[PDB]
Amino acid sequence: MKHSYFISDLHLSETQPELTALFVDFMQNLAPQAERLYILGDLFDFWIGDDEQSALIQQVKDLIKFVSDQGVQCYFQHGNRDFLIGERFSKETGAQLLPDYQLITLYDKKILLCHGDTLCIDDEAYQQFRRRVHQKWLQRLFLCLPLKVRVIIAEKIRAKSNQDKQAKSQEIMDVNQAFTAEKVQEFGVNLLIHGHTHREAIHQQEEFTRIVLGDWRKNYASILKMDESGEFGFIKD
Ligand SMILES: CCCCCCCCCCC[C@@H](O)CC(=O)N[C@H]1[C@@H](OP(=O)(O)O)O[C@H](CO)[C@@H](O)[C@@H]1OC(=O)C[C@H](O)CCCCCCCCCCC
Ligand SMILES: [Mn+2]
Ligand SMILES: [Mn+2]
């Protein structure tokens, strides 16, 4: 039974070693038997450049490389927490980098993949911040700074973002339905998979189905599985 997995929004961090354990069990016991593994952003709590080094980072890279070298096709799509991942991280892990939208053909299904933050177009404060940090010239500037200063910048940008979110309603921090519907029509799909919005769900709209990967918490790993029988669903337990 050929099958593939979809995960996102793990936000791996030394502060939370409960998820890393869940990630190790998934990568060592289920991922090797998969045909493809897609990681749709927010694998790390934050990413400040491909020269980051730590016991947790070298662990996570190893798990991806071990799954990849066994013939599993691994893909990474950027999230908002780790959009700085580049060509070096891709070579070290085997995970091929996908653009912010990617149409795939899997098990006779046309599927649109994105992280999910580009669909929250009513969060205008976030979208303006997203346009700035995605400019290549400023990213080259940021990566020229020493490793230690970028971490504090990241920890404080994280800190501000935690404040601004409590200033926002839940509506504008979720996906705009009309825009999301237009995306699906642009790519000609009946199936859309994304993360970012934290709320694991499967919405069976009339025109299409929208699968939402949830956050990983200490007691739950959100893992979507599709197989060649055309079924899909989240690995419970
Ligand atoms: C080239 C520069 C490199 C910088 C490297 C950055 C390294 C760290 C990046 C991770 C931070 C990331 O969490 C910020 C973010 O995206 N938050 C949005 C998101 O909230 P989450 O909890 O992360 O899901 O989802 C929420 C719902 O959609 C959304 O609301 C949040 O958006 C925010 O809260 C952002 C704040 O509203 C504004 C942020 C301003 C902070 C400083 C801006 C200065 C611009 C810096 C330019 C150099
Ligand atoms: Mn996100
Ligand atoms: Mn996230």
Curated annotation (Swiss-Prot):
GO terms for molecular function: manganese ion binding; UDP-2,3-diacylglucosamine hydrolase activity. Changing H11A: 17000-fold decrease in catalytic activity. Mn(2+) 2 binds at D42, N80, H115, H196. InterPro entries: Calcineurin-like_PHP_ApaH (IPR004843), LpxH-like (IPR043461), Metallo-depent_PP-like (IPR029052), UDP-diacylglucosamine_Hdrlase (IPR010138). It catalyses: UDP-2-N,3-O-bis[(3R)-3-hydroxytetradecanoyl]-alpha-D-glucosamine + H2O = 2-N,3-O-bis[(3R)-3-hydroxytetradecanoyl]-alpha-D-glucosaminyl 1-phosphate + UMP + 2 H(+). GO terms for cellular component: cytoplasm; extrinsic component of plasma membrane. Its EC number is 3.6.1.54. Changing R81A: 7000-fold decrease in catalytic activity. It comes from the Bacteria. Optimum pH is 7-9.5. Is most active at slightly alkaline pH values and exhibits a sharp decrease in its catalytic activity at low pH. The drop in LpxH activity at acidic pH is not due to enzyme instability as preincubation of the enzyme at low pH does not alter the apparent enzyme activity at the standard condition of pH 8.0. This is UDP-2,3-diacylglucosamine hydrolase. The lineage of its organism: Bacteria, Pseudomonadati, Pseudomonadota, Gammaproteobacteria, Pasteurellales.
